[PDB]
Symmetry: D2
Subunit: 208 residues, 4 copies
């Protein structure tokens, strides 16, 4: 069976929840007959995100990495095609660290594209009535960092064989607390986001 590592991130930036973590916790209680599902919550940390992830790859054989992250302001399931070799944000991570114009892997390639059939994923989700679309920038923060890490490791070691990053809307509860014009941000219920990630897992063979 396919070995799948499904990851999410802890809350950050003053949020009390992270949709990626809530989805991972919900799906950790789910049995899929065609895959062996590993789950892992990563820290929002430039240093520790990839240390934790590398330690998991070292101790477990993973065929496919499915990384989830929060993309506040996005309105649909945001499938990321591109990971770039750069850390860059004015905002600190959860360790208080700030990175500006820093490579992830010195003399690594400038970027990787996923080898997953990402448009087929978007099409499957839309046919199941879930808003979904392909994005070409996953940012330059921890989410992109973990994505680039997995695609680079996949390129150099062959493990994981594939990696895909799925950015997620705010949960409605995260927007309900927002002040000013941010009270009008998009959201998607946890039930629908969970269904979307479940559909990806149930149909994984069609995408690799």
């Amino acid at each position: 069976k396919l070995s799948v590592l499904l990851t999410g991130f802890e809350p950050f930036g003053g949020e009390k929840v992270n949709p990626s973590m809530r989805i991972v916790k919900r799906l950790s209680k789910a049995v899929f007959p065609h895959i062996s599902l590993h789950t892992l919550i990563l820290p929002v940390s430039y240093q520790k995100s990839t240390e934790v992830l590398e330690e998991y790859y070292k101790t477990n054989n993973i065929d496919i990495a499915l990384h989830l992250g929060q993309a506040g302001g996005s309105a649909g399931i945001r499938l990321e095609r591109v990971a770039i070799n750069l850390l860059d944000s004015k905002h600190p991570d959860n360790d208080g660290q700030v990175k500006e114009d820093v490579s992830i892997i010195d003399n690594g390639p400038d970027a990787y594209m996923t080898r997953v059939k990402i448009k087929a994923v978007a099409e499957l989700l839309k046919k199941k009535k879930i808003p979904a679309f392909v994005s070409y920038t996953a940012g330059q923060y921890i989410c992109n960092e973990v994505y680039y890490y997995s695609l680079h490791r996949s390129n150099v070691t062959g493990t994981p064989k594939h990696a895909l990053f799925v950015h997620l809307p705010f949960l409605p509860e995260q927007v309900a607390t927002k002040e000013g014009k941010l009270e009008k941000l998009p959201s998607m219920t946890l039930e629908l986001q969970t269904k979307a990630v479940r559909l990806i897992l149930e149909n994984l063979k069609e995408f690799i």
Copy 2:
């Protein structure tokens, strides 16, 4: 009256038929869902209106003549809106380049000749928004409901309320696209906001359950 503060509120909940190429309308679906009016403090009426400049208010007026209504809670689709959009203002104007479902186009037409330029709801609209947010539902107050059929019905009810006393109150609630309506969109429109039917229904349910605190 002689009833003092003990009468059951009669509530008219309306939605609209699909329009603009959509096969569904979230307002119509919520009204159908809430059709099973298990509410302890209200007598719930429901009505689906046509998206038609002429017939929308005729059908609505026909219902107002044949039933007694205390509060009109009008629901409508606001494609592109991300949260429960509580409308505070109805204006005396029909104006859109888009035809209604009968093929009529209205441009800069008064709704009620020599009616006021606009009405604001007298419902405690900020308290509705605050209740929904506290229940973890995105919601906000809007000051334009457009100049299409939704605004028209809103103005009609607030004007009829001012001159006749019936209904006593009116509120219009604009609603996001359902996720299935965005899932079919082309190009950049695939990125529009949506809200599940379950959450939209919960929002309208909460307004109905807490109506006393808003009027």
Copy 3:
């Protein structure tokens, strides 16, 4: 004495900004010669109490046919012609006097709203034909800008002066976006030169709108 008497107003900077496009346009056009109208100019404070006081004193002392009020609408991308003024003060943000108003009428038992009687769609069409992005808006907010607009349309209804009022919301100047951090660095703007031309075009064509 007999040309069209026009009052053009703008507002002082507010909200941490050091400039306001409305003020800059009024300053530029106060220096211009308009041969076919009598142009009055006035910079108003961003103050719930003092904005309409200063405005009222000008109306008391000068006969004004049309009031053309300008204001900043940070985030808007074109010339934003306001059709509706509503009888409400409501914002979490203080004015420049530190005063906050939530859910209060402007005029006790005034109408809920006024629409301009200016031919506002014709204004939008003229600007577009002159290659200037412009559109009609149905909410001018509930802050000082809307307050002044409602004040003028109410005064016009109750006293007859001014005969007309129109409110024009304006994009940020590019220098106001150039200072912004985070995602606000991507906000729309319009140069002072183009904003000034738009307002000049409205003033030059006023006969066609009233």
Copy 4:
């Protein structure tokens, strides 16, 4: 005079009568800079011919820096592109009517290149001169990205050009003024300000390489 600079724009496309990139290049094609030898070139909006025309110019001329301009309708500021990806992909035809879906630009070329120009310093200079400007990490998958990827790939394998940077541009106000429906509210930037932005980049080029 020292740096050989190729400034490019694109022809109108998608139903427009103008392209801001083309107008800027025409306006600047007479401009003399004491530190630069300025080449100008208008490229077709064509998957096939854009890089053919560009390759022919590189083959016959010694270019140090390519500064590519393009239209990004809907963008509000000077949009400095950091990333070119190895992909042609759009629902929309080019001006020759061809459609490309998930086609590599360079077979087994790298998935993407980032510019080696000091792009954050370019953004900071523009902002200090009171011009809205920001760094973008996707230039699309149409002709603009195609030309960008071509130049960065050519730079990596041949050394010519030494550097390339792509600058996406807002609509001109005249392009939004013709728009119907909700598109009448799109952002724009006058030709005068866009031209000043590109002029400032050229004037300060040594700061960025």
